[PDB]
C-alpha cells in the first residue's frame, strides 16, 4: 500500500519546524517538533490528525498503532492562531508531537502524518522518519570516476560500522536511503552493500550512489512586502494582497559555476514590523519568471523548494508566454527568505535530474543524508538505526 503525499489547496506553508527554524522531516527518536501549516480561511476549521508507521517502500507496516505510539491519533488540533492584522487572512495551525494526545512516538522508522479534515478526508499527508542511534554512518561526497559524468556528478561513499547492532544478513536486511538535500523524491534507495569487510558495511561504487550535482537554489527575501529587496523589483499593490515581481531568471546550465550560497531549499518565514512571524507574516502573489531559450522539450518546468514539499502539483507549473518567450507563473508564498529552483518534470512524476534547466555542476554545496534501515527477521518493522550527514563542501575526489 504505497501511501504517498497528498497536496492540499487551501492549506499552504506546511513544514516540520523543530527547534525554531524549519527542518527536513528526519527526526531523532525523542526530538520534539511541530507540523506548522496555515489554512487560508478565517474559518477556524477542525483538522484531525493521524500517524502511521510505514515500511521501507512505504507500505503501512502491520504493527498495531498501540505499539508505535502512546495515546491517540484522531483528535482535532487544539493549538492554532489566526492571521493577526494581515491582508491575507489565514488560520495558523500547529501541533507538537510529544503533545497531550500522542504523548510520544515510541518506534524508529518511517511515518506518515495525515491531516484529514473534520470527517475522514485526508487534506494532506507528509512523510517523516524518526531515526534511532546505533550505527556510525561515515559518509563523504566525492567526485565520480567516469570522466564524462565527472564535472556534473557527485558520487557518495561511506560505511556503516555499528558496535551496537550485529547485522544478521546485511545484504538482505540493511537497506539504505540516500537523500540529496531533504528531498524524498530523488532518493537513491534500495542499494545493497558491496563489501561487508567485517561487522561494518562499506558502500563504495559509483553506479548507484551518484547524485546529479545540481546548481544552487535561487532565493528572494521580501522581509517587508512593499520594499525593493533581494531581486524582487517592481512590487505592486493592486486590489488584492501585494504582488512581488521577481527579476527574470536565466538558465544557468549553459554557463560556468559561480559561487552562490543558499540554505539548500529552506525558507525563513519572517517580516519586519512583526512580533510573531508565524501569524503576522503576509502572503503575497510572487510572479516567478524563467528565461531559458535553450530549453526546448516536451516536459514541464515546475517550481520547487522546501516550502511546497518539492511538490509537482499543477499550481506550480511554469507557463510559456509567447509574448516574451519566457516562462512565468504566480505562486502565493509567505514572506521571508525563500529558496526555490526550476525542476523539470517528465510529465507525471519523473523528474529528469539530468538536463535540468539550472545545471548539474559537481561542486555545488549539497547536504546529503543517509538513513540506515534494518529489519531482523524476528522484528515486526524496519527500524532506522542511524543517519550520517555529509555535505559537498568536501568533495574528496
Amino acid at each position: 500500500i504505497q501511501t504517498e503525499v497528498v497536496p492540499p489547496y487551501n492549506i499552504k506553508t506546511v513544514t516540520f519546524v523543530q527547534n525554531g527554524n524549519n527542518v527536513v522531516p528526519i527526526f531523532e527518536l525523542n526530538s520534539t517538533f511541530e507540523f506548522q501549516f496555515d489554512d487560508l480561511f478565517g474559518n477556524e476549521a477542525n483538522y484531525y490528525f493521524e500517524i502511521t508507521h510505514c515500511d521501507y517502500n512505504w507500505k503501512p507496516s502491520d504493527i498495531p498503532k498501540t505499539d508505535y505510539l502512546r495515546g491517540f491519533d484522531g483528535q482535532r488540533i487544539m493549538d492554532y492562531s489566526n492571521s493577526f492584522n494581515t491582508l491575507q487572512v489565514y488560520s495558523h495551525y500547529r501541533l507538537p508531537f510529544p503533545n497531550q494526545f500522542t504523548t510520544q512516538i515510541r518506534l524508529s522508522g518511517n511515518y506518515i502524518l495525515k491531516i484529514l479534515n473534520e470527517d475522514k478526508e485526508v487534506v494532506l499527508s507528509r512523510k517523516f522518519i524518526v531515526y534511532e542511534e546505533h550505527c556510525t554512518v561515515g559518509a563523504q561526497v566525492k567526485r565520480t570516476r567516469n570522466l564524462s559524468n565527472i564535472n556534473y556528478k557527485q558520487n557518495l561513499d561511506f560505511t556503516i560500522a555499528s558496535n551496537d547492532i550485529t547485522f544478521q544478513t546485511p545484504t538482505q536486511n540493511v537497506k539504505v536511503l540516500l537523500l540529496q538535500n531533504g528531498n524524498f523524491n530523488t532518493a537513491i534507495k534500495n542499494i545493497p552493500p558491496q563489501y561487508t569487510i567485517g561487522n561494518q558495511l562499506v558502500y563504495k561504487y559509483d553506479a548507484e550512489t551518484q547524485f546529479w550535482g545540481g546548481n544552487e537554489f535561487l532565493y528572494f527575501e521580501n522581509k517587508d512586502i512593499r520594499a525593493a529587496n533581494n531581486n524582487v523589483g517592481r512590487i505592486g499593490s493592486n486590489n488584492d494582497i501585494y504582488n512581488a515581481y521577481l527579476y527574470t531568471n536565466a538558465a544557468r546550465g549553459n554557463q560556468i559555476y559561480t559561487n552562490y550560497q543558499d540554505v539548500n531549499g529552506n525558507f525563513v518565514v519572517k517580516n519586519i514590523n512583526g512580533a510573531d512571524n508565524s501569524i503576522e507574516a503576509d502572503y503575497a502573489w510572487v510572479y516567478f519568471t524563467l528565461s531559458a531559450p535553450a530549453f526546448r522539450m516536451n516536459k514541464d518546468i515546475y517550481i520547487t523548494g522546501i516550502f511546497n514539499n518539492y511538490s509537482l502539483s499543477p499550481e506550480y507549473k511554469m507557463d510559456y508566454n509567447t509574448d516574451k518567450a519566457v516562462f512565468e507563473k504566480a505562486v502565493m508564498i509567505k514572506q521571508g527568505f525563500t529558496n526555490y529552483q526550476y525542476t523539470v518534470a517528465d510529465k507525471k512524476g519523473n523528474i529528469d535530474l539530468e538536463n535540468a534547466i539550472d545545471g548539474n555542476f559537481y561542486q555545488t554545496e549539497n547536504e546529503y543524508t543517509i538513513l540506515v534501515y534494518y529489519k531482523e527477521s524476528i522484528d515486526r518493522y524496519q527500524r532506522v538505526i542511524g543517519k550520517g550527514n555529509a555535505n559537498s563542501i568536501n568533495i574528496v575526489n
Binding site: 525593493a228 529587496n229 523589483g233
Partner: peptide, 12 residues
C-alpha cells in the same frame, strides 16, 4: 545598452 536598475530602501 546599459540595462540596470538600482533598488533598495532606507529608513532612519
Amino acid at each position: 545598452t546599459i540595462d540596470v536598475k538600482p533598488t533598495g530602501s532606507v529608513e532612519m
